[PDB]
Design a protein around this ligand. Structure first.
Ligand SMILES: [Cu+]
Length: 129
């Protein structure tokens, strides 16, 4: 069982992967976010957020309005399944979530919720496989 994933966010506003597989024997799953490159958090902060595919838009829209000091997410947003904090370069964060939070016949999206980042394709698929 592969129950973690190491994902990178760079200075060019991209993740180094577009698709996560969550093995369904996993009781928990861990995302290790890191930020290579040379740019601070207020310039090019990244976070990793999980929601259903349907919820992504609203989570992003409400998140952008909440701002950088709220880590670009609406506080307590119930559409947020799991999330990291906002990180700048040279920084890192992990999240671990329960796999029982995912369901068959739902589609899941991961993304960064920093202003306009997900619109520029900092996002990808999350699949129970
Ligand atoms: Cu980002």
């Amino acid at each position: 069982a592969e129950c973690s994933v190491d994902i990178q966010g760079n200075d060019q506003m991209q993740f180094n992967t577009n698709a996560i597989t969550v093995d369904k024997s996993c009781k928990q799953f861990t995302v290790n976010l890191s930020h290579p490159g040379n740019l601070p958090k207020n310039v090019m902060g990244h976070n990793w957020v999980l929601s259903t595919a349907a919820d992504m838009q609203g989570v992003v829209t409400d998140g952008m309005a909440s701002g950088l000091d709220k880590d670009y997410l609406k506080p307590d947003d119930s559409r947020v399944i799991a999330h990291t904090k906002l990180i700048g370069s040279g920084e890192k964060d992990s999240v671990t979530f329960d796999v029982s939070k995912l369901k068959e016949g739902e589609q899941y999206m991961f993304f960064c919720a920093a202003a306009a980042h997900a619109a520029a394709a900092m996002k990808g698929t999350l699949t129970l496989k």
